[PDB]
Amino acid sequence: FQENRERNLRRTELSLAIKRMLEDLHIDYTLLPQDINLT
Amino acid sequence: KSVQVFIWLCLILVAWILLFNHDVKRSPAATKVLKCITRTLISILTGAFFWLVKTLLLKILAANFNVNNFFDRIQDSVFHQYVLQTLAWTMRVLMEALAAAYHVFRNVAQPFFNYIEEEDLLRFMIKEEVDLVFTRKAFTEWVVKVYTSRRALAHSLNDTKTAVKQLNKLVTAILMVVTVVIWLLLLEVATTKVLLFFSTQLVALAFIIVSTCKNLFESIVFVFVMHPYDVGDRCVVDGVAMLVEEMNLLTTVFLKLNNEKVYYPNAVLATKPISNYFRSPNMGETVEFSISFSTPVSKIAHLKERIAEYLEQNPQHWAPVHSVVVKEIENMNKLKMALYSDHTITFQENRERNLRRTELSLAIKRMLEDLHIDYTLLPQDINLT
Amino acid sequence: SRRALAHSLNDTKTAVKQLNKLVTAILMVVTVVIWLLLLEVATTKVLLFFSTQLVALAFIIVSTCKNLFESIVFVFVMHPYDVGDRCVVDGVAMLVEEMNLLTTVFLKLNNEKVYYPNAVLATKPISNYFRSPNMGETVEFSISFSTPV
């Protein structure tokens, strides 16, 4: 961890790679369904 | 002066003792008078030696601070003398040493001449000296900054001198009292029983002043030995920026961002971290922003390139070195990034730092606006009954 | 790395020189009082008064001498870090710049010069990045509970 800049750059690259990988796999997150009744 | 007085006193003492070494019983009463006189002479010799060691200690501490103190003072004095010409002995000179300055500088410079008048500098100093010393507005700002730095250095020197004077007064007081009791004991005016009672009373007094003497002495150690900050330097204590105004043996006047006068005991500071902005090198800065998780990597690359070009095209405020990082991903809805850059100055100039940070934030906002980057909340579905 | 090692060696030499100066001072004063006592220049009563004065001085410098000596112990015996090695104190990364008998210059991620007393560090954990082996990393992400295995 001495090379803070290099570690941060590598972590950013890993995060971007993970984001791309999730994008290709078609993985989505949805909130809890909510029901509404009118009066 | 101290050594001269010491040698004079020792020479007088030895001359008297050698002359009086004769064993003549002039009178039984005269023996007591001679004994008292020689006891007083040796007592004053001891007092002179104590004064000599006191001044030696004070001078060594003063010079330990004075290496840097007089370096800065000499630099400021040389700058001030050069400016005036264009328009120990060192300690005395340093002690002796705005709109008016700007007006004077403008008058010296040729009218309608933004650049520094080379002819004026040449007539006042050599070309090499003028170049080493070195826009009319920029020159005026530099002169004002130099004058402010010289004034701050003079104020710091005055505060250090006042603290040294207080310490000298305390040391002198203690040495007077110890030599007075030494003389009283050497004259055997009182008996032993009362002497022992007084010794016990002094022991009790010490046991009473335990806490105060300990706190004061550790305060001296913190002020001198540690020397974490000087006058006129902004420091962060307990995570809040604070500016040093005046330093004492037990009180340190501080000014916050809102000109809040705070008296911080020196003993407490000895157990807490202290950060100095003035001595620190060029400081960094962080800007926090978030953008949608679905943005293409091409937009991120374009943003990074534009940030690099903006930073490199303004070297006067930010250094070329920079870094764009991603902290963490939460709900994969927004990405957390921080922009790291190094300012051309320290954090002492709070107003300038804040203005530069505001300019950087506005620039980043504009850059995001041009790139067409938007953030949307998590989609929500609703079913009716 | 060579420049950092040279700077660390210079800092260690400066600390050793300060300790040598302190030790030399104390040994000069003790030998001076030894000589004065051996010459029996003064009487016993004043000698006892001076002994009591020295006892009072020690009782006054209790805290400072204790703190300084434990600082030496922490710097030398424990030896938790050297110059040029990044360390985490109280959960914040900090880079060592220079080490003294009572002051340790530190540089944070934003080049913040912080003077940390050595005595306080003796009662807090210290982490050294330079001496540690290859370090790990963690990345946090969340995905829908209904995704197939």
Numbering used by the authors:
A (entry chain B): 693 to 731
B (entry chain A): 248 to 334, 387 to 396, 432 to 468, 481 to 731
C (entry chain B): 495 to 643
Quote the study on this structure.
Amongst the Arabidopsis MSL channels, MSL10 is enigmatic in that it has two separable functional modalities, regulated cell death signaling conferred by its N-terminal soluble ‘death’ domain and force-activated ion channel activity imparted by its C-terminal portion. When heterologously expressed in Xenopus oocytes, MSL10 is indeed activated by membrane stretch and displays a preference for anions. In Arabidopsis, MSL10 is primarily expressed in the shoot apex, root tips, and vascular tissues, playing a critical role in adaptation to hypo-osmotic shock and induction of programmed cell death. Analogous to DmMSL10/FLYC1, each subunit of the heptameric AtMSL10 channel is composed of a transmembrane domain (TMD) with six membrane-spanning helices (TM1-TM6) and a characteristic C-terminal cytoplasmic domain (CTD) shared by all MscS homologs.
Of particular interest, transient overexpression of the G556V mutation, near the helical kink in TM6, in tobacco epidermal cells resulted in a well-expressed protein as assessed by confocal imaging and the planta cell death assay. However, recordings from excised membrane patches showed no detectable currents of G556V under applied tension, indicating that the mutation stabilizes a non-conducting conformation. To better understand the open-to-closed transition of AtMSL10, we determined the cryo-EM structure of G556V at a nominal resolution of ~3.5 Å. The global structure of G556V is almost identical to that of the wild type (r.m.s.d of ~1.1 Å for all Cα atoms). Importantly, pronounced local conformational changes occur at the F553 hydrophobic gate, though the pore-lining helices align well with those of the wild type and the helical kinks are maintained. Introduction of a bulkier hydrophobic residue, valine, at the position of G556 pushes the aromatic side chain of F553 toward the central pore axis. Consequently, reorientation of the phenylalanine side chain reduces the pore radius from 6.6 to 3.9 Å at the position of the F553 ring, which is now remarkably similar to the dimension of the corresponding F572 ring in the wild-type DmMSL10/FLYC1 structure (3.5 Å in radius). Together with the lack of activating currents of the G556V variant in excised membrane patches, we conclude that this conformation represents a non-conducting, closed state. The wild-type AtMSL10 structure has a wide-open pore, whereas a non-conducting mutant G556V renders a much narrower pore created by repositioning of the side chain of F553, which appears to constitute the hydrophobic gate in the closed state. Closure of the channel pore could be essentially accomplished by local adjustment of the side chain of a critical residue defining the narrowest pore, while the global conformations of the open and closed states are similar.
